[PDB]
């Protein structure tokens, strides 16, 4: 009990590490390259179809219905989706096979010809892709365990690591050997959990399919809209220079790195404050955001301040060069920006779902992606990754216009004590910078916590009790 425990933390660690491992050896093997764009197309591919049949849109949409059923109708049922979803990937493997040219324009339509040529076989390597990892995540989304550690809970890794193995090899066989990577692990997931699925029946069946598709189209569509940001950017990106897509790809690692730190801890705070009951919205509004802004603006400030010091420590190894470290944190920068704008969209749009209030959430979205898009045209046309960046921090901000001035409440004192906090928190950071140790960042990251929580502590009774609670 107790080392099983153990083992288990250790190894879901791990997990979270691997991306950042793995954007890291890219990195350092390829730095950035017209041949690593054409990789970036092609697991483009299958990223996006994934995104439409992979185990989040299973257990979305299949696994409720799944769980309806029991006894023989329910092993006909999986029958029926694995044949019916088996029959449509197999036909857009063909059709990316036949049509190569289509799909990687549609990606990557602003690139170079030998980039488009590279990108070519590197998608007949990856297409197949897709089949295995839909089958991989409707048996992975099947799965009931009585056992505490979910062990089938590692197997999203298995992919990434392969893809890592690959990279150490690229210097014996070039990109292809990530790419060949991708498309191993994804057949090796699934053989990771092929002992589970055998266990049931198979039926030779599509009789409810049609069915199934109606009642899956919502999810779909969902799906594909929230693709439909990422294309755009991905395909604007692409015009400008050799290289434009791999600088998105690594300061996309730390676009997100706040949002995905927060998720662990801020979000269960933020979220317990929004209420679901409708007399009490706007104070448990208000709270939540004063939570919101605790955390995002210092954030963004440190990040923005610090953002060459960890781009350079994490990615400037073998072929990334100084100056790509230079442009990745300027993307960085641009779309750091946005952080707290999106932050209070969030709490905003949660607060709003959690009184069952659809329209004005929907529209704020509409909004964001449609001056998100008008954006990229403008400024990532003319000046490629740091354009997209700022264009989407950009579409932030009007979409917190939007929604502050539907809801119309706002903690502006509590606001600004942040903002000051954050503020002298940034001029000790100044101060601390003129030293040029490589590693030295760390430690004003440390120092700058501290010196946000002492004047914070200062400011507010109980530092917990306000926003931690």
């Known amino acids: ?30 730095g950035v390259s017209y041949e690593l764009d054409a990789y970036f197309i092609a697991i483009m591919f299958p990223f996006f179809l994934r995104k439409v049949f992979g185990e989040g849109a299973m257990s979305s949409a299949f696994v409720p219905l799944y769980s309806e059923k029991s006894g023989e109708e329910k092993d006909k049922f999986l029958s029926s989706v694995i044949n019916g979803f088996s029959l449509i990937i197999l036909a857009l493997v063909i059709l990316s096979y036949f049509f190569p040219e289509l799909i990687i324009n549609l990606f990557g339509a602003g690139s170079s010809h030998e980039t488009k040529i590279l990108a070519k076989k590197l998608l007949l390597i990856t297409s197949p892709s897709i089949y295995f990892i839909f089958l991989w995540a409707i048996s992975y989304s099947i799965l009931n365990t009585n ?26 066989y070039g990109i292809i050997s990530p790419t060949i990577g991708f498309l191993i692990g994804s057949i090796l997931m699934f053989f990771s959990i ?10 030779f069946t599509i009789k409810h399919f049609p069915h199934f598709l109606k009642l899956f189209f919502p999810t779909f569509m969902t799906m594909v809209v929230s693709q439909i940001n990422t294309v755009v950017d991905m395909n604007v990106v692409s015009f400008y220079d050799k290289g434009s897509i791999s600088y998105l790809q690594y300061a996309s690692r730390f676009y997100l790195l706040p949002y995905g730190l927060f998720a662990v801890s801020v979000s269960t705070v933020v ?11 706007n104070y448990h509004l ?35 060069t100084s100056k ?16 707290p704008f999106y932050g209070i969209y969030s709490t905003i ?30 400024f990532g046309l003319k000046y490629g990754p ?77 530092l917990i009790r306000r926003f931690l609670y």
């Open 1 to 30: 009990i107790l080392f099983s425990s153990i083992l288990f933390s250790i190894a879901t660690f791990f997990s979270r590490i691997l991306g950042l491992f793995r954007d890291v050896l890219f990195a350092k093997y390829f």
């Open 147 to 172: 056992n505490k550690f979910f062990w089938p809970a590692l197997t999203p890794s298995i992919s990434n690591i392969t893809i890592i193995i690959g990279t150490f090899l690229s210097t014996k």
């Open 286 to 320: 208000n709270d939540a955001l004063k939570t919101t802004l605790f955390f995002t603006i210092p954030s963004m400030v440190g990040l923005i301040f610090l953002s060459t010091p960890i781009i350079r420590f994490f990615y400037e190894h073998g072929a990334f």
């Open 386 to 462: 740091i354009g997209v960046a700022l264009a989407t921090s950009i579409a932030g901000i009007i979409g917190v216009l939007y929604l502050l001035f539907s809801v119309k409440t706002f903690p502006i004192k509590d606001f600004l004590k942040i903002s000051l906090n954050s503020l002298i928190m940034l001029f000790v950071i100044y101060l601390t910078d003129f030293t040029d140790n490589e590693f030295w960042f760390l430690i004003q990251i440390l120092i700058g916590i501290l010196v946000y929580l002492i004047f914070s502590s200062i400011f507010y009774r109980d």
């Open 194 to 203: 092929i002992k589970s699925i055998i266990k049931h029946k198979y039926y």
């Open 271 to 281: 979220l317990s404050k929004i209420s679901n009951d409708r007399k009490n919205f």
């Open 349 to 378: 749009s949660r607060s709003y779902h959690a009184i069952k209030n659809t329209k004005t959430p929907f529209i704020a979205a509409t909004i964001v992606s449609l001056s998100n898009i008008i954006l990229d045209i403008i």
């Open 324 to 339: 790509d470290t230079l442009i990745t944190s300027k993307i960085l920068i641009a779309y750091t920006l946005g952080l």
